[PDB]
């Protein structure tokens, strides 16, 4: 069976109004899986997308690591929007795809792209790289048609 | 074009050894999207799955909200494991599906399941519910074949 259909024989709510479901919900109880194991004070907050999906933000406190954690995704109705059966997608940095397009012999410096030229990263085993490595990486990116003026260079420790 | 193929005309590394790529990488630079906007001190840590995919954990500091944030997902080769082109899936609480199977007239208390009877939540607009609402929610779950002994009831404020 699909991961985007309900369990066999389980009936879903059939007069759902997503507008009244928006906002914050407290998780009272869960069946445990790896992702939520040990989380406390868990909430989910739903908002309506321009395209008719729901966006959601999940928040919970991890007592082990002593810090708040969060997750973001979207959900789309699989049928009529009055039937509360939805398909879920979680958000993250590397949308759609992860393609290594440059890599040194020693696996120290990588240029990684997504599914089109709007998705590009420079990754390193070290928090800083030499201007020489920056210039080599920017040359490969430019030669393959990425606009390297779009880079946000990330704050890292000295 | 697919979100799980590289940009047109971009060539990927073709003698990739995922074993040498494992462990921690620092994000030196990114093209900005909603998910990473404003994040500092960003890393990704790769590990090998039993099924041949890569697991990854992304970590970054959000200076706005003054706290560390993290994200988890997996990536699978789309072809030969020596061609560094991968499809990405992010992890979260509500795997595969989100199905509302019980809801009161006032949109205050919900029973929500995933794609099989191993996925179940009780959600509330309030951090606590009455034993009456607990018993109503557990009765519906039991009547539809969920093992309500699997619930972890979540710590919430009084
Ligand atoms: Na492109
Ligand atoms: Na089932």
Author numbering:
A (entry chain A), B (entry chain A): 19 to 176
Sentences copied from the publication:
In our previous work, using a combination of computational and in vitro screenings we created a panel of FAPs from bacterial lipocalin Blc (named DiBs) capable of recovering the fluorescence of synthetic analogs of green and red fluorescent proteins’ chromophores. The lipocalin fold contains a single eight-stranded continuously hydrogen-bonded antiparallel β-barrel complemented by an α-helix. Fluorogen-activating proteins (FAPs) are a group of unrelated proteins capable of binding to non-protein ligands (fluorogens) and increase the fluorescence quantum yield and/or change spectral properties of these ligands. Here we report on DiB-splits, a self-assembling FAP split system which has been inspired by the domain-swapped structure of a full-length DiB protein.
Our attempts to structurally characterize other DiB proteins in apo and bound states resulted in obtaining protein crystals of DiB3 in the apo form at low pH conditions (pH 3.5) which diffracted to 1.6 Å. The asymmetric unit contains only one protein chain. However, it forms a biological assembly (dimer) with a crystallographic symmetry mate. The intertwined dimer is caused by domain swapping: each of the two Blc-like eight-stranded beta-barrel folds is created by the N-terminus of one of two polypeptide chains and the C-terminus of the other. While DiB3 was previously successfully used for in cellulo protein labelling, we proposed that the observed domain swapping was driven mainly by the very low pH conditions of the crystallization buffer rather than the private DiB3 mutations (V74F and L141Q). To further evaluate this assumption, we calculated the interaction energies between N- and C-termini fragments of the wtBlc, DiB1, and DiB3 proteins using Rosetta38. Despite the fact that wtBlc protein seems to be slightly more stable, DiB3 is not an outlier, suggesting that the introduced mutations are unlikely to cause the domain swapping. Independent from the reason that caused domain swapping in the crystal, we reasoned that the DiB3 protein as well as other mutants might have two relatively autonomous and stable parts (residues 1 to 108 and 114 to 177). In our case, however, the obtained DiB3 structure is pointing to a potential cleavage site. In this study, inspired by the obtained domain-swapped crystal structure of the DiB3 protein in its apo state, we designed and characterized a novel DiB-split FAP system.
